[PDB]
Design a binder for these strands. Structure first.
Ligand code: DCP
Ligand code: CA
Ligand code: CA
Ligand code: CA
Ligand code: CA
Ligand code: CA
Length: 901
DNA sequence: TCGCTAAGCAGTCCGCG
DNA sequence: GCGGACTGCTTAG
């Protein structure tokens, strides 16, 4: 096989590399790598190395990496550019793996672990590690085994061995319901004392040294706790055995308002799953506890136990160990679904970076661009310091707040990467500048043509047309990979809809789900067989279709995230190719594009309708426009349509056959106007929306910018079995909105869009009447909690104290003198509830850690004093008032003359 | 929360005769 | 009460 790296590190003048050799074996080596860097040189000096601007360079080969680093410093001292890859491990990877890396995940040791620490006096601080580690579960991907290290004797209690038999049993049999499919994969090791547990764990670690190390909060908790605990008991040299090169470093992670410490383990790639999830999932969650995320992702119930976690080991050690094992498995289950590890490996190996660098788009693109340029013997420029300066972004049209009955949306494909490729935007393709007219003059095609030679953006920039820049070349490669995965995602989605349709008529028979590839549209044969299947087989197929869609989503959305990240990195001062001229060339071109095409669509539709100056485009944001289709529908007349699907087909055909060709013509003219290198403004129909035929539904509404709701029948070619609400920006979409309130507001919107005013009034009356019965957690607001200390003046709110922070201060007073009570953690999320006048907490609200029940110490009082009235007005009534006012609708029936009978 | 801009709403403080 | 200046937070893209 082709060899591939696992990890790479620089330690002084040595590169330490763990890799898979040509026989599939894991190896380690120390290489005394001599790096090269570059200086500009005279024309007369014949060279094969040129900087990105075509200026000649001489290569300087250093005796060692420290010499190269010293040279960089001296060049700064002199005031001359030191060119080349200054991150020597990336240069090493480039030299050692000079080909597209083909990797084999089955040879990469992926370790998933979780530790337990019993702590009487509150949260066990990983920098102190003052409490024994009493359980470790460590899953190894190569062995496919869960290794359980169980401490039976502790100063906090001696316990009996954990029983796998009881663990397997149902909760209803007194068991722990450890999933049967992992029961045979558990390797249980009880220990008489902590020292032998930890020593054996290190020997195990040495035999089975993780390459990728993950779990939940492993970087912020488990890793530093294990390191520091071993350090405290045995000394530093023993703790450093967690590194295959015996090198570790305390790394201080700084933010706006403080800092924290993590432990860097040289020769290991830590990908904490909580951070992979935050980066790659595109969710914003009210809580990031593993129980909360597992419930959300997997629909598995919360792990239930009695008493506080600090007494679980002594009261129920059996459950304590079982829950440690389940915790590790939950993460593997999330990954089986989301496939973020697979994604990280794909991106890391593509860029030729340390796998953990996937968290940094700057580092990822730096390595991609470096490798690409190196292929042509070109030399990368030195990074420079730049002051942070704001720059303009996208255009967002101000909508007229209203109901909108029939709506068709159109969307530019991968806008910013397409702009980059179209205009040819790159550090080395800058050709010069032209005199800019106001943007509106370009939008209306009245400004002078920028250039007859170069490719232009309306910010005043001109670019070469003879050859692609490195940024367009490399962005195109990832754009093209994404396209394939988006295709699989959309096919799986369409396939899902076929199964949902068939589920209306399940057959009374015993059968199996079909063995099919959900990444490809079902053939007619598969479709025939589906129509004959039972509900059991159909639901199983639906689950699989949906899992395939998720896999496609992960692969495609994060590839999109990376290429959009390149556009954004051009405006980050730490990027090697930072240039506000280029960053702004992209965004300003985007503003023109959207407003240019708005004008073109209005002009086209006014022509077909035989009108003048009517606004068909009701809204736009960045890369999309929303077109009112009422007049198109009315031109044939609603009576002419057999059903909803009939007018959806008609609008689908109108968009594809009439509007898209008109949009294309409009954008080709714009390309010529800007003299761009290649026309790549591809704007396709996105959504078709409206009320069910013959209903009183309003179809859609806008309240303002980035705030709207549509009843959608077709999205990007997916024809839904049932209409889907597309709600953007409204309170139903915000993690801050109470769970039950999101749900109620969503149903109010559904009724508005699908059924009309009377249906809405019916539901509102019932909700208002019954909501006081809702569970307190379901009606609590959520907020991130920053700067708690800043606003804390002797336990009371300081000037300008935010509402959620006030609530935390209230909580803190109420739990004062309890080392046991859960503490609110700076920077994390809290639930927030309002309190009625004259309550014993002495303030108008209380807040406690999100994803948890409030402590029993005060729960009864909180429930008794909760202000339901304030809760309802603020979270439900006020947003609903916004929705209905915009839609020109009433949520309460107004009095009429009919009331007199 | 270690790892692009536009823009919405909640809440504080205080003016507005 | 509402709105503007301001902080804080969370969206859409
Ligand atoms: N983090 C982000 C997100 C978006 N955008 C900009 C660039 C995008 O091109 C544009 C629209 O983003 P979308 O994700 O809505 O869709 P794209 O057009 O990028 O991709 P698709 O091909 O899915 O339409 O907004 C950005 O600069 N940075
Ligand atoms: Ca735990
Ligand atoms: Ca788009
Ligand atoms: Ca599209
Ligand atoms: Ca059937
Ligand atoms: Ca869009």
């Amino acid at each position: 096989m082709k060899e591939f790296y696992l990890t790479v590190e620089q330690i002084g003048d040595s590169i330490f590399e763990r890799y898979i050799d040509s026989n599939g074996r894991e190896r380690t080596r120390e290489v005394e790598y001599k790096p090269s860097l570059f200086a500009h040189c005279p024309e007369s000096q014949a060279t094969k190395y040129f900087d990105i601007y075509g200026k000649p360079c001489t290569r300087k080969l250093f005796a060692n990496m420290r010499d190269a680093s010293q040279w960089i410093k001296r060049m700064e001292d002199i005031g001359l550019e030191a060119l080349g890859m200054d991150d020597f491990k990336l240069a090493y990877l480039s030299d050692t793996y000079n080909y597209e890396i083909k990797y084999d995940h089955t040879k990469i040791r992926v370790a998933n672990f979780d530790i337990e620490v019993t702590s009487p006096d509150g949260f066990p601080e990983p920098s102190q590690a003052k409490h024994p580690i009493d359980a470790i579960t460590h899953y190894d991907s190569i062995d496919d085994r869960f290794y359980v290290f169980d401490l039976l004797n502790s100063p906090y209690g001696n316990v009996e061995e954990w029983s796998i038999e009881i663990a397997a049993k149902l909760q209803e049999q007194g068991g722990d319901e450890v999933p049967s499919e992992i029961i045979d994969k558990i390797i249980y090791m009880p220990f008489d004392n902590e020292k032998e547990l930890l020593m054996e764990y290190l020997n195990f670690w040495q035999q089975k040294t993780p390459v990728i190390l993950t779990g939940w909060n492993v970087e912020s908790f488990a890793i530093p706790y294990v390191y520091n605990r071993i350090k405290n008991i045995f000394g530093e040299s023993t703790a450093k055995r967690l590194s295959p090169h015996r090198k570790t470093r305390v790394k201080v992670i700084e933010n706006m308002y403080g800092s924290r410490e993590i432990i860097t383990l040289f020769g290991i790639s830590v990908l904490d799953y909580i951070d992979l999830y935050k980066k790659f999932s595109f969710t914003n969650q009210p809580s990031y506890s593993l129980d909360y995320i597992s419930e959300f992702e997997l629909n598995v119930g919360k792990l239930k136990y009695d008493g506080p976690i600090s007494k679980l080991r002594e009261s129920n050690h059996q459950r304590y160990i079982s829950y440690n094992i389940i915790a590790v498995y939950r993460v593997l289950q999330i990954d089986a679904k989301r496939q973020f590890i697979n994604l990280s490996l794909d991106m890391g190996y593509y860029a030729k970076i340390q796998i953990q660098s996937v968290f940094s788009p700057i580092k990822t693109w730096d390595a991609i661009i470096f490798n690409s340029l190196k292929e042509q013997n070109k030399v990368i420029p030195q990074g420079r310091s730049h002051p942070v300066q704001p720059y303009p972004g996208a255009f967002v049209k101000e909508p007229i707040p209203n109901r909108y009955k029939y709506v068709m949306s159109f969307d530019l494909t991968s806008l910013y990467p397409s702009i980059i490729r179209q205009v040819n935007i790159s550090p080395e393709t800058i050709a010069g500048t032209f005199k800019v007219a106001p943007l509106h003059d370009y939008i209306n095609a009245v400004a002078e043509r920028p250039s007859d030679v170069y490719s232009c953006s309306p910010n005043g920039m001109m670019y070469y047309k003879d050859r692609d820049g490195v940024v367009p070349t490399e962005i195109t490669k990832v754009f093209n990979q994404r396209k394939e995965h988006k295709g699989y995602m959309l096919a799986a989605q369409r396939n899902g809809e076929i199964i949902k349709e068939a589920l209306h008529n399940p057959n009374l028979s015993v059968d199996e789900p079909l063995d099919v590839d959900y990444r490809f549209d079902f053939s007619d044969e598969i479709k025939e067989k589906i129509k004959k299947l039972s509900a059991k087989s159909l639901n199983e197929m639906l689950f699989r279709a949906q899992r395939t869609e998720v896999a496609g989503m992960t692969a495609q959305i994060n590839r999109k995230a990376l290429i959009n990240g390149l556009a954004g990195a051009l405006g980050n001062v730490w990027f090697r190719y930072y240039d506000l001229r280029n960053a702004t060339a992209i965004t300003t071109f985007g503003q023109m594009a959207l407003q240019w095409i708005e004008r073109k669509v209005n002009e086209y539709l006014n022509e077909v309708c035989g009108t003048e100056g009517e606004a068909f485009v009701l809204y736009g944001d960045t890369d999309s426009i929303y077109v009112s289709a009422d007049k198109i529908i009315d031109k044939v007349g609603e009576s002419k349509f057999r059903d909803t699907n009939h007018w959806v087909d008609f609008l689908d055909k109108f968009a594809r056959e009439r509007m898209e060709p008109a949009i294309d013509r409009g954008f080709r003219e714009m390309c010529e106007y800007m003299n761009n290198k290649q026309h790549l403004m591809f704007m396709d129909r996105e959504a078709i929306a409206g009320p069910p035929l013959g209903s009183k539904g309003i179809g859609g509404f806008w309240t303002g910018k980035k705030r709207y709701a549509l009843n959608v029948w077709d999205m990007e070619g997916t024809r839904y079995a049932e209409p889907k609400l597309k709600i953007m920006g409204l309170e139903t979409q915000k993690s801050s909105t109470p769970k039950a309130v999101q749900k109620a507001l969503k149903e109010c919107i559904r009724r508005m869009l699908q059924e009309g005013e009377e249906s809405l009034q019916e539901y509102f009356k019932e909700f208002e009447k019954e909501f006081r019965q809702l569970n307190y957690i379901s009606i609590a607001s959520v907020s991130s909690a920053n700067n708690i200390a800043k606003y804390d003046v002797g336990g009371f709110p300081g000037p300008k104290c935010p509402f959620h922070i006030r609530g935390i201060l209230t909580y803190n007073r109420a739990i004062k003198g309890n080392i046991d009570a859960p503490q609110v953690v700076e920077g994390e999320k809290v639930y927030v509830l309002p309190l009625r006048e004259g309550n014993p907490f002495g303030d108008k609200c209380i807040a406690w850690p999100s994803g948890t029940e409030i402590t029993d110490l005060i729960k009864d009082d909180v429930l008794h004093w909760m202000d339901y009235t304030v809760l309802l007005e603020k979270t439900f009534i006020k947003p609903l008032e916004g929705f209905t006012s915009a839609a020109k609708l009433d949520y309460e029936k107004k009095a009429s003359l009919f009331d007199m009978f």
